[PDB]
């Protein structure tokens, strides 16, 4: 469970990154595909997996929108992400081992641009948030 402290810390990061959000989504997704190429099997439609390819760009926007939604729904992530959980379980069948990988890539992408926001105690708040997001997305698997 996220404390009030964690929630404030997460929402404030999210406000801070707003301007650069679509860039962040595109680059993090680029990182996941190149750094953890096991994830490529889910996106074999896209010929160009470079960040700045139109499809990586467009889907990066979508992931960040999903995360903005999670932020809006931070008090009950399970309820707030039920549709997306269902989608990742049954329409796609994403291996939930992969959720942690995306999370790490978002954190890394953010650290390259906003390094001052990455004090250990804030990173602790962000990691709890992404861990709860992953758990919420995993809810509908079984």
């Amino acid at each position: 469970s996220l404390s009030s402290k964690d929630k404030d810390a997460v929402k404030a990061l999210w406000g801070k990154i707003a301007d650069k959000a679509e860039e962040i989504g595109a680059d993090a997704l680029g990182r996941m595909l190149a750094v953890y190429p096991q994830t490529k099997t889910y996106f074999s439609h896209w010929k160009d997996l470079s960040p700045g390819s139109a499809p990586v760009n467009k889907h990066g926007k979508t992931i960040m929108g999903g995360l903005v939604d999670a932020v809006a729904s931070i008090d009950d992530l399970n309820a707030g992400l039920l549709a997306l959980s269902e989608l990742h379980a049954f329409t796609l069948r994403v291996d939930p081992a992969n959720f942690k990988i995306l999370s790490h890539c978002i954190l890394v992408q953010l650290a390259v641009k906003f390094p001052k926001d990455f004090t250990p105690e804030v990173h602790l708040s962000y990691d709890k948030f992404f861990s709860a997001v992953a758990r919420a997305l995993a809810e509908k698997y079984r």
Binding site: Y36, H104, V112, K113, H123
Partner: protein, 145 residues
């Protein structure tokens, strides 16, 4: 492991830019704060509170030791398993460190290095760094072969 030229250059390049004392100290403190159960493996290191962990001289020292341990692999990239043979024994048979923790520590180091290097830590660069850490973590875990 077959390293590409880009990969070898990038790994040496990264470590040549890291102050082992600063980065190691920061990485270990980060792990003990973000994943606080990891503290149990250091129960003989004194006062551990985030500010206490940040100020602990034993943690600063052991963080430096980890970076020097990684340097051994940077200086021996084609022979990491053999180089880490005694370290692997130590962290399993002696210290009984659950292997997930090697990934936790590796991810902290990656975030520490990404914050330092900034724009320079591209997807391509992180890809090479992570291949390196995967080989290192595979060599540090209990060896069945």
């Amino acid at each position: 492991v077959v390293w590409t030229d880009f990969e070898r250059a990038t790994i040496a390049d990264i470590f040549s830019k890291l102050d082992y004392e600063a980065v190691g100290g920061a990485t270990l403190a980060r792990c003990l704060i973000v994943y606080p159960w990891t503290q149990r493996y250091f129960g003989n290191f004194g006062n551990l509170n985030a500010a206490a962990i940040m100020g602990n001289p034993m943690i600063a020292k052991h963080g430096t030791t980890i970076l020097h341990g990684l340097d051994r692999a940077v200086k021996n990239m084609d022979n990491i398993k053999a180089t880490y043979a005694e370290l692997s024994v130590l962290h399993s048979e002696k210290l009984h460190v659950d292997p997930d923790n090697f990934k936790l520590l590796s991810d902290c180091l990656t975030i520490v290095v990404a914050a330092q290097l900034g724009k320079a830590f591209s997807g391509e660069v992180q890809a090479a760094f992570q291949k390196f850490l995967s080989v290192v973590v595979s060599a540090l875990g209990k060896q069945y072969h």
